Symmetry: D2
Subunit: 287 residues, 4 copies
């Protein structure tokens, strides 16, 4: 029977979420996009305007099958959690049912139980400051949006998931080793994410027979990556120069691994940080 995957964190076609959606489509997985409200209408415009048609090609006979595309904000757990300021926002005022709980309800109401969950989102409002100059509000924002949001996602989605479902998120090696430009408590958020992945694997594994893993991806010139002050170009030039595999890293490279982790093929893997980065993580120094 059909499998359904909710992917939280799609803003365009240039990030890992799209890559994952693409590769799942090779396997005939029905895709639901969770899109952050501020960029939801523009995404919808581009999509309707056919801007993504070329990017939706799987191959000769296949074309990405997107079930639905919904507004999703990981800043908010339930309806009660939205503040008046966001309520009164140009971009949000015209949308509804976009809190993490509302989306689970809405999906379940529309299409029943799902069996695949992808957390592909991060945010840190002080990413451009180093850790030592990051404010408490800044740091807790990184953690709220980039780490707590995985926990909330699970808390609310497990009700609408079949036994033997699988969940993945995306991390970065800044958590384990210093990467000077990865500021604002983003390194910290990733660190908590990778540990939470373990603690969750235990809970979800024991209570629901549901698996959860995280992919530590190498650099990709995505929207958010360009936001960091360029960082991402140095990162890519460095990976391509010194990684064991001197080949350009594509989002569908992470996509194919995500697909495997999300399938019954990896029935015995849970609680892991899997490195999909051309082996760059294994190097001590430039050679």
């Amino acid at each position: 029977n059909e499998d359904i995957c909710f992917i939280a964190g799609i803003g365009d076609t240039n990030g890992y979420g799209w890559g994952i959606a693409k590769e799942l489509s090779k396997r005939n997985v029905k895709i639901i996009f969770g899109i952050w409200p501020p960029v939801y209408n523009i995404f919808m415009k581009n999509y309707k305007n056919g801007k993504f048609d070329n990017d939706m090609i799987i191959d000769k006979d296949k074309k990405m099958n997107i079930l639905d595309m919904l507004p999703f904000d990981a800043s908010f757990d339930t309806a009660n959690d939205i503040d008046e300021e966001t309520k009164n926002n140009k971009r949000y005022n015209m949308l509804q049912n976009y809190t993490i709980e509302d989306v689970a309800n809405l999906i379940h109401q529309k299409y029943g139980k799902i069996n695949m969950l992808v957390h592909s989102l991060a945010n840190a409002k002080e990413v451009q400051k180093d850790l030592l100059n990051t404010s408490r509000k800044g740091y807790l924002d990184a953690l709220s949006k980039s780490s707590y949001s995985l926990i909330s996602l699970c808390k609310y989605f497990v009700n609408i998931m079949k036994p033997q479902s699988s969940i993945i998120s995306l991390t970065y090696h800044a958590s384990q080793k210093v990467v000077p430009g990865y500021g604002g408590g983003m390194s910290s958020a990733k660190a908590a994410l990778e540990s939470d992945t373990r603690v969750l694997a235990y809970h979800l594994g024991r209570n629901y027979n549901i698996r959860i893993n995280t992919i530590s991806a190498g650099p990709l010139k995505s929207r958010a990556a360009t936001a960091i002050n360029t960082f991402i170009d140095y990162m890519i030039e460095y990976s391509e120069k010194y990684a064991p595999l001197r080949q350009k890293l594509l989002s569908t490279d992470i996509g194919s691994v995500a697909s495997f982790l999300l399938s019954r093929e990896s029935r015995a893997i849970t609680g892991q940080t899997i490195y999909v980065d051309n082996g760059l993580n294994i190097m001590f120094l430039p050679d």
Copy 2:
């Protein structure tokens, strides 16, 4: 010349902070206690009442030399950050200059530049819930109080520290491996703490020639440990049964290591998680 250590996180004599204060005293380090406001007066009462006199004995000729004891709340960065509710609290209303910045100023005003800093505090208001049932507010509290507080401590204290100063904090292996009762995002807070320790080592090391490390201690029946629902007794019974070293773990065991890390003897060590837990971390399973 004299060395001064600020220890943040002393509530009684039964935790790691006291252990560290004791061992630093063997080396004639002047100790300043940072004490959380809610328990400051009771600590002061006990101290004046002589309740701690036996616990202050170093040995035949030495007696812990406590320079000062100040109210300290890691919840608050500066004066501006205190809310009206805490302002209007029985325990705080009668105290002042207890925010992280105020304490650095106050210490520096009183005794000049210090050269040793100890973060020995944690808190998580939902520690009794597992990760999956922890609320966003709960989780961010763990992180604010247990992890951001190290960053803030450094941001503000480096101004009042000599070159070649050293800083330590305390972590727990729950960050790296699942420990089912360590709830409320405490595992997450520790994970972020250990990663932050690295990122900070880079910044402080390069800019100020200041070192920072963290000690992953094994279980000790402390005030906060008894708070966890008992957990701590199982933990201790287990460590004593299966650790490589079948010997009771004492706070001064962590104390002696802290003393070494805080001294010039470990001039070449920074950014590390050091395990002071009778080797328990090396075991896969009960033997």
Copy 3:
């Protein structure tokens, strides 16, 4: 089209080698078995008699496509390494082209370049002794047969492998955490093997565009697992009781991850220790 895999280390159908063969067979990969001479003829007689006929049942009717079965000894790099006594041993006198180089040469002659390599073998004379009690000779035996053998397979098989080829081995968590009973220097060999996997990922990735990883498998009741003093019953019981995923771990659970890592889907993963143990490695203590 025309994927060929050499699986080094199969004596019967109760191992992880068998499980890897079955899952690869499912993707229509051509299987070549490398078989240690002590057990080769009993394996062939068993095979011809159709004792494995039941074990080759894949799903609804599909049967294993074993392309060849070759005598193989990972002890010997080249014909010139073989000592006179082994050459004339009862079980070896009747066999040829069983050294690492010779099986490389052989495979190439009969089938051309292959693109998949599985190191699925370990040995140690003194596995029953704990590390402290292991002789220099028995430790070097363990390293030689269990660790050097991977380096040697690589040096020789890289010649007969197409660019973008993939290589896996199997490891155990005793290299990272203490597991009493895993003696003879087998933990040392797994440690070395997990570290050689990184060093090799570098050389092979840069010079040949070939990937190599290692699977850290959970416990399985194979022939060799029993030769360890029982140990394995305890291991399996511990695992089924305490793992996040309380299911029986099957050889085909490993096989499908092996399959994935050998395929182009894992193009961006190299140098890695991938855990396939139902998440047991993430646990600190039992509950």
Copy 4:
């Protein structure tokens, strides 16, 4: 009172062994040098002539207290292991009681039980070759001399050591991350050695109440470091440029950590790889 340390691996004053001896000497520990026979006599002639007289200067006048200097070869476990050719080699014919057991026996006879043990030696015939190019013999050479030797020292010295004694060795980060140039299987040996340190911490902690750890030292221009193909100049330059702590790493920086780990102050630490490299290990890439 009456601490005795056997330091295995000193040829001159340019190593980490020298640095360990100097720092131990500062705490009034009695030093016994174990000296590889190829360099023993040139070391003695040098010593008697007072070539090391300058190097024994500690602080304001204090000089090293070398209690003994013994020929020692970690290749040989017992007299019966020594091959006829080595026995009659020019440099060995004039020496006795140089195997591991014999130096144990010897030390015990002349001084009684000791309480500190330093493994400060490595070797590999084919260090100049990369892993892929290393022969079976040269790999086993590396493991034998660099890794087995620690297990063997332990098995024999535990007999002549008091409860609560301590044991250190030296390792390098090439076991965990790829370092081209660190060939011959030296990375494999360090991997094995860091894993054997855990296994040994278990046995020795439980059966003898003895601790063992390992220091992962940063680069130092010792005799052996130069024998590696230059490699070390590059290593030191990289390290001084990119480490969190941009200071020159001295042998005595290692020595004072060794001292700490051998003393009772580290009573609760066992099984650990302690990094002494100015924090370089925490770095992902240069800046």
